[PDB]
Design an enzyme around this catalytic site. Structure first.
Site, PDB file in Angstrom:
ATOM      1  N   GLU A   9       0.755  -1.197   0.057  1.00 46.06           N
ATOM      2  CA  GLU A   9       0.031  -0.116  -0.209  1.00 46.06           C
ATOM      3  C   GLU A   9       0.939   1.536   0.031  1.00 46.06           C
ATOM      4  OE1 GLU A   9      -3.023   0.149  -0.210  1.00 46.06           O
ATOM      5  OE2 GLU A   9      -3.777  -1.550  -0.143  1.00 46.06           O
ATOM      6  N   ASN A  21      -7.332   9.723  -6.298  1.00 45.41           N
ATOM      7  CA  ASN A  21      -8.311   8.711  -7.446  1.00 45.41           C
ATOM      8  C   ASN A  21      -9.080   9.207  -8.720  1.00 45.41           C
ATOM      9  OD1 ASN A  21      -7.478   5.794  -5.130  1.00 45.41           O
ATOM     10  ND2 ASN A  21      -7.358   6.103  -7.181  1.00 45.41           N
ATOM     11  N   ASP A  68     -11.969   8.670  -8.750  1.00 49.05           N
ATOM     12  CA  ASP A  68     -13.497   9.459  -8.703  1.00 49.05           C
ATOM     13  C   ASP A  68     -12.870  10.492  -7.515  1.00 49.05           C
ATOM     14  OD1 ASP A  68     -12.597   8.412  -5.628  1.00 49.05           O
ATOM     15  OD2 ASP A  68     -13.576   7.021  -5.879  1.00 49.05           O
ATOM     16  N   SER A  89     -11.055  10.273  -4.662  1.00 46.96           N
ATOM     17  CA  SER A  89     -11.112   9.822  -3.313  1.00 46.96           C
ATOM     18  C   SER A  89      -9.454  10.159  -3.762  1.00 46.96           C
ATOM     19  CB  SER A  89     -11.807   8.530  -3.384  1.00 46.96           C
ATOM     20  OG  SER A  89     -10.935   7.568  -3.571  1.00 46.96           O
ATOM     21  N   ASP A 122      -6.361   8.200  -1.090  1.00 43.96           N
ATOM     22  CA  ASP A 122      -5.745   7.047   0.172  1.00 43.96           C
ATOM     23  C   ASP A 122      -4.946   7.487   0.814  1.00 43.96           C
ATOM     24  OD1 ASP A 122      -7.396   5.667  -1.470  1.00 43.96           O
ATOM     25  OD2 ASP A 122      -5.859   5.096  -2.386  1.00 43.96           O
ATOM     26  N   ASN A 148      -9.472   5.084   2.251  1.00 43.33           N
ATOM     27  CA  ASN A 148      -9.657   5.811   1.172  1.00 43.33           C
ATOM     28  C   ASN A 148     -10.468   6.620   1.809  1.00 43.33           C
ATOM     29  OD1 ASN A 148     -11.474   5.857  -1.034  1.00 43.33           O
ATOM     30  ND2 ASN A 148      -9.769   5.831  -1.869  1.00 43.33           N
ATOM     31  N   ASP A 165     -15.605  -4.161   8.971  1.00 41.42           N
ATOM     32  CA  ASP A 165     -16.962  -4.023   8.097  1.00 41.42           C
ATOM     33  C   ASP A 165     -17.604  -4.879   7.243  1.00 41.42           C
ATOM     34  OD1 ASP A 165     -16.196  -2.934   4.642  1.00 41.42           O
ATOM     35  OD2 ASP A 165     -17.977  -2.592   5.683  1.00 41.42           O
TER      36      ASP A 165
END
Ligand code: PT
Ligand code: PT
Ligand code: PT
Ligand code: PT
Ligand code: PT
Length: 128
Positions: A35, A46, A48, A50, A52, A59, A101
């Site tokens: 990562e 990213n 979209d 977003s 990280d 994110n 989650d």
């Protein structure tokens, strides 16, 4: 800070990640390497809008608010900049939320580049 392998593994152990939800510590060290290459300051943009953030590249769409992405949910309830600190606490605590989650599937680089390997090799030769 750019951690070294055993340094991060020890820091992750103490914040309670060895074996969190069935994921041994090598998994998290391995995910951090791919990562972020151990870099507590890494940020990636990213498609979209977003981003990280941090050692575990969490994110902003779902997990933290950076005020510069839609549309985000802030489910860890923190600003994303909190995830760029040299002390990994906020990231570890947010990472516990994310695996509470579909397990560690959330981390693309983990499934890509760690899952399936002898992940315990990541911690071998460390005082823990
Ligand atoms: Pt730093
Ligand atoms: Pt710590
Ligand atoms: Pt902790
Ligand atoms: Pt091996
Ligand atoms: Pt070591």
């Amino acid at each position: 800070k750019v951690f070294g392998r055993c340094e991060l593994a020890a820091a992750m152990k103490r914040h309670g990640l060895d074996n969190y939800r069935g994921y041994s510590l090598g998994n998290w060290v391995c995910a951090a390497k791919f990562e972020s290459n151990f870099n507590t300051q890494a940020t990636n943009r990213n498609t979209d809008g977003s981003t990280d953030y941090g050692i575990l590249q969490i994110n902003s769409r779902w997990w933290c608010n950076d005020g510069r992405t839609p549309g985000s949910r802030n489910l860890c309830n923190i600003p994303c900049s909190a995830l760029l600190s040299s002390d990994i606490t906020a990231s570890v605590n947010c990472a516990k939320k994310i695996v509470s989650d579909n397990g560690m599937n959330a981390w693309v680089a983990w499934r890509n580049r760690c899952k399936g390997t002898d992940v315990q090799a990541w911690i071998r030769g460390c005082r823990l």
